[PDB]
Symmetry: C2
Subunit: 140 residues, 2 copies
């Protein structure tokens, strides 16, 4: 009912969060990488931070696949779902690419990547779709 | 009453989400800082990143005061809210400290701060608060 959508919402939202956690951890690995170049390294290591971001990006893919396999109400928009998946797939792909640039030490390319646009296109769709699902609440 | 929950959950989630975008932005700024100091600055500027971070930390403050003023059902746990507040206030205050540290060139104190621990601690209370509200939705 209003619970099949509250449950589909929560799945999607754990994808959002894990993407945002992957992104931040990766940007931590960036600082440490830069410090190591200036031999002022300290705290968490590049290798450990990359490990957590490999972790949370895999968690991201698994949270996504669970949100897809959830059922959809017919009253929900199929173009919406497909636009959610288009932006996710760019965003996740972008974070998967950050993992490679850093391992290869491509700090500028790493940092010049417009992850922020990819994320914003995905956040745009997320916010729309939660409005369309909150409406389904208002009317049930 | 069921509507008053989703409203709470959405206000609190919006704070979470924004606490995470701020952390990522801050870490972006430290990479760029490090880069400026090594004369390989590219991408977005420290100044642009620090003003996004300043901006999103106020949105978090605001998102938070909106969640707080939403009426809390009597079946919801006053200790649970109090513990969210505790971990929220540590986490928020910590990202505020990161703004001051980076402004001051204090990159090691920036990178060393145990932000993860404050985030984890907030996320623990948030995950538990949701499962409770979700069991509570279930009942009704
Ligand atoms: Cl590069
Ligand atoms: Cl961008
Ligand atoms: Cl320092
Ligand atoms: Cl920590
Ligand atoms: K991890
Ligand atoms: Na943006
Ligand atoms: Na929300
Ligand atoms: Na600098
Ligand atoms: Na910029
Ligand atoms: Na603002
Ligand atoms: Na407090």
């Amino acid at each position: 009912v209003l619970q099949t959508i509250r449950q589909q919402q929560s799945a999607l939202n754990a994808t959002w969060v894990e993407l945002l956690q992957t992104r931040n951890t990766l940007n931590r690995a960036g600082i440490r990488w830069m410090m190591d170049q200036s031999n002022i390294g300290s705290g968490a290591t590049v290798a450990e931070l990359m490990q957590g971001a490999t972790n949370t990006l895999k968690l991201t893919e698994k949270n996504w696949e669970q949100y897809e396999a959830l059922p959809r109400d017919p009253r929900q928009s199929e173009a919406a779902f497909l636009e959610i998946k288009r932006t996710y797939d760019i965003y996740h792909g972008a974070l998967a690419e950050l993992i490679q640039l850093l391992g290869a030490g491509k700090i500028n390319e790493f940092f010049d990547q417009p992850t922020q646009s990819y994320q914003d296109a995905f956040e745009k769709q997320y916010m729309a779709y939660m409005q369309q699902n909150d409406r389904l609440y208002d009317i049930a």
